Amino acid sequence: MADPRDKALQDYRKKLLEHKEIDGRLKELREQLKELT
Amino acid sequence: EQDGIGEEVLKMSTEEIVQRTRLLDSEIKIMKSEVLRVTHELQAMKD
DSSP states (O other): OOSHHHHHHHHHHHHHHHHHHHHHHHHHHHHHHHHHO | OOSSOHHHHHHSOHHHHHHHHHHHHHHHHHHHHHHHHHHHHHHHHHO
16 A cells, blocks of 8 residues: 555455465365374 | 544544454464465375
8 A cells, every 4th residue: 555564454354264265275174084084 | 434533533542443453464464374274284184
């Protein structure tokens, strides 16, 4: 925007979303492990 | 919103903003690899 510091802020958000997006996949693949164990 | 706003820039220190950008990048390698290792782990259990 008006600061490089804001460019930086906007990237944290993509990562917050990214951390979530992965956690959902991770858990679906995880359930499957449990049956095999 | 929750990021990208002017308030947050004012609120934090300028130094801390540099350290936070570095630290967070590192987490991504490890998380992405965590998901893949599981996908492989599934085949390994099957074997």
